[PDB]
Ligand binder design. Structure first.
Ligand SMILES: Nc1ncnc2c1ncn2[C@@H]1O[C@H](COP(=O)(O)OP(=O)(O)O)[C@@H](O)[C@H]1O
Lengths: 459, 577, 43
């Protein structure tokens, strides 16, 4: 096929064609030019007069005389299989590798089909990470999405690699099959530079966790609409390998800011009523469409859990990207530049980072009967210490009451021993022992959150 | 009736040509498959259908057929204890009919057409019947579900069915003019079920939370709004209002919420026990789920469906309690539809008819005496999500000036893990002056005076806290530091409540009044002792501090004695020294 | 006090800056709507 010639406009991303009504809305095309090089596209806003395309690669060398556009498929769909569990793809899905394409087993769409609110179940199992600021105060369970609000020069890739390497479930603390469950990473990156990509690949190759993970790469010297396409492919593969083959996947989505940028660029070139500070109106819809693809169903036993890394641009929690992401997901982890100055690692600010699906995955019979209570008390004491910091900065350190100094020293010990942990794999019990050691630095009877029984049993 | 073809399908909205005579808001069925939409335009001979589905994969030339009916619902027995979609599709049936996904183009009735019901005659052939009258009764599990005459209908009953067991399709009454009345009927959602006259609210809406019951009350006809940034608890508080209220029925509308947030209700509620009859709690809930990846016009569709169901139950005679979640999603749906219409937007893109819709939706809530001579009530608690937390968004402002209470959530109180994070000086209430007769009749006699004293103490301590932050909380006098410390004791022992304890999750009025009495008596005696000359450090080390502190983790049975013992102990120990 | 006044001045300048962009986009939208409706006599 070489039909549908007679384009009549080219400017940046877009490209128009004259009378063509048999192209279905949202189809896929391929744009051959006068020298054989074939590009890609996607039909938006079909109509009886013309039809607007959205080129993927670029628009260099396309003239208005020798240029055609042909139909490939009436809907976007990726050819998934199980043989793609050691491979490495790019953007749209060609293999950037020395091996031929795969022989598919089923080809499903990449757009949607949400889960039925009655075919779900509450995520309950508990997965520890070895980061005592996430195991003890911001619990991470299996079936929940939890971003990492990074920064410019703050270590977020290192924390993601550490979580991916240390994360393991604890079956012998609630009663389950002892040894059954490794993970399966579906790392999907859109916009990463060369340094960060080389770091990630080195790290994955050091631990041997590469022969059970798929890779979609969209490095920074590539087009942008491919960034618009990549995460849908990733989540399609993940949902397949979970709800069909009983795996437990862990999708790492990197730099959602570049995805939002490509979105804003196509919206601008479309002139579509900017919502708030640039970015168009439907960005909540788009981010939700690619976030809500991670849950757990009943009957099956697979699971899909996410960790979308994203760099809040100017360190503003009020920027539209972090704002909408926080409204959509359930939980968050937030790094701290001030703590990064003082050599702490991981510099996870423990105040503004919460997780919602925690009261159901922790408590008596799952980890230990005193977990959430130590959590509440540690939060209260740290808030008091932080306030007394400002009291000091107003008055002076020698005009302080005898217990305000206790709270101050608790805050400093907390920032120095509980948060800073290097690259070591802790345990829930070691971290709770450290937490109780710290909480014993304060006197008894001034902890109105814990019960007297636990107070007597641990101190 | 009127058939046309598609011309300009683009995004979530199409443009059908060859359609002359189509009304302005009826429901069309676009596409070769049926993708029910809605008309909002009429330009010469085309139309602007607004689809409620995906539209991914259509073409140009596929037919569109009008219906001439503006989005009715189905009102009758069978609604309680069930989920629905935005346009009233049973989620359970769709699940068992397709699988775990939600495909497009599924046709299922709203009310069941197979189960039998226990009819009971209530008329006599030859009587005169008018709209809203009673016709019979059908026992649903725990309630005596009535059946009614659709409004704007009258005649002379000719022959009724005797008792028995029928479906919802057998006409149980046959009027003389030939009109047959089923056990259900349809109602367009954008209208309002008429009444006789609207009464004045004079009884509270007990909800369990000490703050939202003692300080900022809401009458049993009222309205409210819980705005705040993400990470405050605009959902924990609404779920607690849904599981510890005093209403009869509850409708939980989710307009752009989380799938997990809506499935943690379908799983737990058929295990708890409603605090009025003992049955399961899922026998009074009609929740209407519409998550964040389903189609985009189903948002407004779901809001209107929920309000019409609540008004039906009010006309029946119960005391409903609507609960609309995140009305801001409605606003953003309207913004997208406007950006497709290509119109002129007001501030921040929101179309120039936002406030009208919100007012018309908030103004069908209140106690009323319907056409059968009974009483009903529809209370509304609509969450609001500002785009940065600022109370200057058009939705956050237009939702003032129309409501009663207003429960402004604060972010720092939610970072300190101090829940609930109700800011005690940005909120307000307007009902707290018509409920005093009810308080005097059913709680105590000087409960208004105790409430006034508590509020005055809080909102006088604030001024001293200003000077505290200026100078430091040590250059103050003794009475001033006493006021600061009493304020802190209040703030941590009477305005704090953990929704995950076993007995500190439902505090009643007598228990709240008891705690207030203890606090006031302690403050009085401490004032006297400070005048005497004893030191504030000893006054604070008095262990009645910890007694009246932990006095909230008690149950509700031994409190009438615990309170007496602690009261006498305070009165003794603060004159011992 | 002068530091707070400087902060206020900066915030006020940014808030006023982010209204002229809106007025500009609105005027362009109005121009496009006029250009389109100038061709919608019938069809
Ligand atoms: N009454 C409460 N008691 C204890 N914790 C609460 C209470 N309300 C909210 N929380 C905590 O605050 C968080 C708010 O959750 P959610 O309601 O989903 O977000 P939002 O309040 O922003 O809508 C929850 O994770 C919960 O742990």
């Amino acid at each position: 096929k070489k039909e549908y010639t007679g384009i009549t406009y080219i400017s940046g991303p877009l490209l128009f064609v004259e009378n063509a009504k048999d192209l279905a809305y949202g189809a896929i095309v391929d744009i051959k030019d006068g020298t054989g090089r074939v590009r890609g596209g996607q039909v938006i806003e079909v109509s009886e007069e013309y039809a607007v395309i959205q080129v993927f690669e670029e628009t260099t060398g396309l003239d208005l005389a020798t240029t055609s556009v042909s139909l490939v498929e009436d809907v976007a769909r990726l050819g998934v299989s199980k043989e793609m569990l050691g491979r490495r793809f790019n953007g749209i899905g060609k293999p950037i590798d020395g091996l031929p394409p795969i022989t598919p087993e089923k080809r499903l769409p990449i757009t949607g089909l949400p889960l039925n609110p009655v075919a779900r179940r509450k995520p309950e199992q508990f997965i520890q990470t070895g980061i005592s600021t996430i195991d003890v105060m911001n619990t991470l369970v299996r079936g929940q999405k939890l971003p990492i609000f990074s920064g410019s020069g703050l270590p977020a890739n290192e924390i993601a690699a550490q979580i991916a390497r240390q994360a393991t479930v604890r079956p012998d603390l609630s009663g389950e099959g002892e040894k059954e469950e490794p993970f399966a990473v579906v790392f999907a990156a859109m916009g990463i530079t060369q340094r960060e990509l080389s770091y990630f690949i080195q790290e994955f190759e050091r631990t041997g966790a590469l022969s059970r993970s798929v890779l979609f790469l969209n490095k920074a010297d590539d087009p942008t609409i491919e960034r618009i396409l990549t995460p849908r492919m990733a989540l399609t593969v993940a949902e397949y390998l979970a709800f069909e083959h009983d795996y437990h996947v862990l999708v790492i989505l990197t730099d959602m800011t570049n995805y939002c940028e490509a979105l804003r660029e196509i919206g601008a070139a479309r002139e579509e009523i900017p919502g708030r500070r640039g970015y168009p109106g439907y960005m909540y819809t788009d981010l939700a469409t690619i976030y809500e693809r991670a849950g757990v169903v009943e009957g099956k036993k697979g699971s899909v859990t996410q960790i979308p890394i994203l760099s809040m641009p100017d360190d503003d929690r009020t920027h539209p990207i972090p704002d909408l992401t926080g409204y959509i997901t359930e939980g968050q982890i937030q790094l701290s530049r001030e703590l990064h100055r003082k050599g702490i690692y991981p510099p996870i600010d423990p105040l503004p980072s919460l997780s919602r699906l925690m009261n159901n995955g922790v408590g008596k019979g799952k980890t230990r009967e005193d977990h959430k209570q130590v959590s509440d008390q540690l939060y209260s004491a740290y808030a008091n210490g932080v306030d007394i910091r400002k009291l000091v900065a107003i008055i002076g350190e020698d005009a302080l009451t005898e217990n305000d100094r206790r709270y101050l020293q608790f805050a400093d010990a907390f920032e120095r021993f509980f948060i800073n942990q290097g690259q070591q794999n802790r345990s829930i019990e070691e971290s709770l022992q450290i937490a109780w050691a710290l909480l014993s630095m304060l006197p008894q009877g001034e902890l109105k959150r814990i019960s007297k029984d636990h107070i007597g049993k641990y101190y | 009736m009127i058939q046309g073809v598609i011309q300009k399908i683009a995004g979530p909205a199409v443009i059908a040509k060859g359609m002359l005579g189509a009304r302005m808001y009826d429901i069309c069925k676009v596409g070769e498959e049926g993708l029910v939409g809605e008309i909002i335009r009429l330009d010469g001979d085309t139309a602007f259908v607004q689809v409620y589905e995906d539209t991914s994969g259509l073409k140009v030339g596929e037919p569109v057929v009008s219906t001439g009916l503006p989005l009715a619902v189905e009102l009758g027995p069978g609604m309680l204890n069930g989920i629905y979609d935005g346009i009233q599709r049973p989620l359970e049936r769709i699940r068992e009919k397709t699988g775990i996904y939600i495909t497009r183009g599924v046709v299922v009735h709203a009310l069941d057409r197979e189960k039998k019901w226990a009819w009971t005659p209530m008329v006599k052939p030859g009587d005169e019947v008018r709209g809203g009258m009673v016709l019979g009764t059908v026992p649903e599990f725990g309630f005596t579900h009535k059946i009614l005459v659709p409004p704007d209908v009258r005649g002379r009953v000719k022959e009724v069915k005797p008792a028995g067991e029928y479906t919802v399709e057998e006409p149980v009454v046959v009027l003389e003019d030939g009109t047959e009345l089923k056990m259900y009927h349809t109602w367009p959602v954008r209208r309002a079920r008429p009444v006789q006259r609207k009464l004045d609210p004079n009884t509270p809406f007990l909800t369990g939370m000490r703050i939202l019951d003692v300080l900022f009350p809401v009458a049993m006809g009222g309205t409210a709004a819980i705005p705040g940034p993400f990470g405050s608890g605009k959902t924990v508080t609404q779920q607690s209002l849904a599981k510890w209220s005093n209403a009869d029925v509850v409708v939980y509308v989710g307009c752009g919420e989380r799938g997990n947030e809506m499935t943690d209700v379908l799983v737990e509620f058929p295990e708890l026990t409603d605090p009025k009859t003992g049955g399961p709690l899922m026998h009074r809930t009609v929740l209407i789920a519409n998550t964040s990846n389903m189609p985009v016009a189903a948002r407004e569709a779901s809001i209107y469906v929920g309000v019409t169901i609540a008004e039906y139950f009010r006309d029946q005679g119960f005391s409903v309690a609507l609960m609309a979640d995140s009305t801001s999603r409605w606003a953003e749906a309207l913004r997208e539809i406007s950006s497709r219409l290509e119109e002129m937007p007001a501030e921040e893109g929101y179309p120039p008819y936002l406030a009208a819709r919100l007012a018309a939706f908030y103004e069908r809530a209140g106690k009323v005496i319907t056409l059968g001579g009974e009483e009903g009530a529809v209370t509304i608690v609509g969450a609001v999500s500002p785009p940065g937390g600022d109370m200057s968004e058009p939705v956050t402002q237009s939702t003032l000036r129309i409501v009663g209470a207003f429960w402004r959530l604060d972010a720092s109180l939610a970072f300190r893990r101090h829940f609930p994070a109700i800011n005690w000086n940005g909120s307000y209430s307007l009902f707290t002056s018509a409920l005093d007769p009810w308080y005097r009749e059913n709680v105590a006699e000087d409960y208004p005076e105790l409430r006034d004293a508590i509020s005055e103490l809080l909102q006088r301590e604030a001024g001293l806290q200003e000077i505290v932050q200026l100078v430091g909380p040590d250059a103050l006098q003794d009475a001033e530091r006493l006021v600061i410390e009493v304020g802190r004791i209040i703030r941590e022992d009477f305005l704090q409540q953990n929704a995950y304890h076993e007995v500190d999750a439902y505090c009643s009025m007598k228990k709240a009044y008891g705690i207030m009495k203890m606090i006031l008596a302690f403050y009085k005696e401490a004032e006297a002792a400070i005048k005497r000359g004893v030191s504030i450090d000893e006054i604070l080390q008095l262990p009645v501090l910890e007694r009246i502190g932990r006095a909230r983790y008690v149950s509700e049975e031994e409190f009438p004695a615990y309170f007496e013992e602690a009261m006498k102990e305070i009165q003794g120990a603060f004159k011992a020294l | 006090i002068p530091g707070i006044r400087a902060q206020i001045r900066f915030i006020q300048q940014v808030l006023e800056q982010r209204e002229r962009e809106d007025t500009f986009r609105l005027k362009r939208i109005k121009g496009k709507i006029e250009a389109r409706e100038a061709e919608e006599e019938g069809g």
